[PDB]
Design an enzyme around this catalytic site. Sequence first.
Site, PDB file in Angstrom:
ATOM      1  N   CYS A  78       3.235  -6.995  -4.253  1.00 22.93           N
ATOM      2  CA  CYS A  78       2.141  -6.037  -4.172  1.00 22.93           C
ATOM      3  C   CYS A  78       2.473  -4.970  -3.137  1.00 22.93           C
ATOM      4  O   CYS A  78       3.211  -5.212  -2.183  1.00 22.93           O
ATOM      5  CB  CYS A  78       0.828  -6.733  -3.802  1.00 22.93           C
ATOM      6  N   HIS A 130       4.965 -11.951  -1.528  1.00 22.73           N
ATOM      7  CA  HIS A 130       3.784 -11.144  -1.298  1.00 22.73           C
ATOM      8  C   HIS A 130       4.204  -9.857  -0.596  1.00 22.73           C
ATOM      9  O   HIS A 130       5.281  -9.768   0.004  1.00 22.73           O
ATOM     10  CB  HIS A 130       2.759 -11.901  -0.455  1.00 22.73           C
TER      11      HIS A 130
END
EC number: 3.4.22.36
Lengths: 88, 4, 171
Positions: free
Chosen positions: C159, C111
């Site tokens: 991301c 992430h």
Amino acid sequence: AIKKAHIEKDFIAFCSSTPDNVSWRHPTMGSVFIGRLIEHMQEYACSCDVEEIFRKVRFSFEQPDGRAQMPTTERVTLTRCFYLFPGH
Amino acid sequence: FLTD
Amino acid sequence: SGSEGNVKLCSLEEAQRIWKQKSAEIYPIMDKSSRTRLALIICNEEFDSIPRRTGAEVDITGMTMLLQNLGYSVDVKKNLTASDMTTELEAFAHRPEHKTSDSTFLVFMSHGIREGICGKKHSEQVPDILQLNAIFNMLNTKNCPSLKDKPKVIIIQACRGDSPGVVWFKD
């Protein structure tokens, strides 16, 4: 004797999306960017340098498809072409 | 599909 | 099926056409018989407070085999805090193999947010973040003299924020 060298040189980074934006992943097929990068390296490492391969990866994302993302090359200080010469 |  | 797997080979013909076209503009490659190429993959899939990144094992498999195909010995480290990632990067930078290598790859998969890469314990209340800036600093000429003048390729799957990355226009 001593000599001066550039502190930061011969780097390239390749990120899966542009700043502020999401990158996509599938539970069975994996991350879209990683799979696309693997496919392009397999096809083009023999004939294109790394900067050109990464540009082709960006081109493959050019059309949004519900899960738009645009990989971005960052902080580039390569001074030469990096060819991988697979097989050698 | 999910996001990272 | 061969060391290079599914990576299409550069024939010796194709290697000489590249080699004297842009001769003085190509990074030099070390002898295959003696060079000790290294690559590092850091992948976080299970997190203390963030959803599990299902499919990460496919990414590890694909990138590990790819980098081996291109001639790199691959270390794979999983589920690290940002502090652990720093310790592992410093250890990677200190490896004696880099002196007899011509290049390296580093792959990070996690992430992420705008500021950088999430460690396994990241939360909104207690962030656990590795910045791309720290990665560059740990691998530069001062902190990794063994890789001076050699290409260092950093790949990041993460991301960079919460936005969909699109705008509408009238067709």
